[PDB]
């Protein structure tokens, strides 16, 4: 029992079960399928969901808060969306619910990132159509020749107490607009690393203070990882982020792994047995046993669609 290979899916976890949905391969994976990976046993279970099932999408943004799945955005066969769904997995047959949220939602987009803080889901960045909204938008000129698309640096809050969208008034210098960056939350710090913007897959590291809404840039002393998009960034402790895979400005698929030590502001390269298994647009989830479970994604330049090496392998890192 194993799910088909795919890139651009979502994977969220409670530390024990990892829920996999969506993505595409070589096209979109079946919308009603929810794959559950037991991190302790290593076994899969497919279930068919009901209710307001989202369309099959890549680049959607999902979270698991107290075993409630939330999903925003993505790209389906007719383009980007800004719909918001929730799937309670706490129990019966799982039923999707499309949440008609109050307030101004974000623009339709995919390949963004989210931080979870108290009752708030905080979404940053992504790629989609021209957006009233705070922040900046920057067109992708390769989309001009349909609807043009571009990157944003937008921060949006969905307050789960009321399912109301809003935007915080931030201080500091936001990261540039970007997509396929990776976000990770530790405490009240929402970290974002890398991502694609114009002609670069970037190497910069920021966090947004989720209490005071101040942006900070982190300059680590010493060797930093090469700039990338489509990588994963995973909290593995109150003081370490785990970086794996991605895709460089020069289209190199990556298999390096690093841990960022927050308190020392330092990157440490991480040796592992998958140096011959680069992955981009995979997912990664931390286990309660201190592991990082990488699933899916593409082993080569997925931009050459007819040659794309999509994967269904589980990679287990012991951090």
């Amino acid at each position: 029992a194993c799910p088909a290979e795919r890139s651009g899916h979502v994977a969220v976890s409670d530390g024990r079960h990892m829920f996999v949905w969506g993505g595409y391969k070589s096209f979109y994976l079946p919308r009603e399928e929810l794959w559950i990976y037991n991190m302790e046993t290593g076994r899969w279970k497919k279930i068919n969901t009901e209710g307001d099932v989202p369309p099959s999408m890549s680049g959607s943004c999902a979270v698991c808060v107290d075993r409630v799945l939330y999903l925003f955005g993505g790209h389906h066969s007719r383009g980007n969306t800004n719909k918001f769904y929730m799937l309670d997995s706490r129990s019966r047959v799982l039923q999707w619910e499309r949440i008609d949220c109050q307030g101004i939602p974000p623009s339709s987009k995919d390949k963004l990132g989210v931080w979870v803080y108290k009752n708030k889901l905080i979404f940053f960045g992504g790629y989609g159509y021209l957006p009233k909204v705070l922040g900046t938008f920057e067109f992708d000129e390769t989309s001009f020749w349909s609807h043009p698309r571009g990157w944003n640096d937008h921060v949006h809050i969905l307050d789960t107490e009321t399912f109301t969208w809003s935007q915080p008034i931030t201080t500091g210098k936001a990261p540039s607009p970007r997509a396929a960056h990776a976000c990770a939350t530790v405490g009240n710090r929402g970290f974002v690393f890398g991502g694609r913007y114009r002609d670069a897959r970037m190497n910069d590291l920021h966090y947004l203070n989720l209490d005071t809404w101040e942006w900070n840039e982190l300059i680590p002393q010493g060797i930093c990882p090469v700039g990338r998009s489509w990588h994963s960034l995973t909290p593995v402790s109150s003081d370490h982020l785990f970086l794996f895979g991605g895709f460089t400005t020069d289209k190199q698929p990556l298999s390096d792994a690093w841990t960022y030590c927050i308190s020392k502001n330092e990157w440490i390269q991480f040796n592992h047995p998958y140096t011959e298994k680069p992955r981009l647009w995979h997912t990664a989830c931390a286990s309660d046993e201190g592991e990082v479970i990488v699933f899916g994604g593409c082993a080569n330049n997925l931009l050459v669609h007819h040659r794309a090496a999509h994967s269904n392998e589980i990679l287990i890192f012991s951090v």
Binding site: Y24, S58, Y127, F247, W281, L302, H305
Partner: peptide, 6 residues
């Protein structure tokens, strides 16, 4: 399609 902008 899905991969643009990354």
């Amino acid at each position: 399609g899905p991969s643009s902008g990354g």
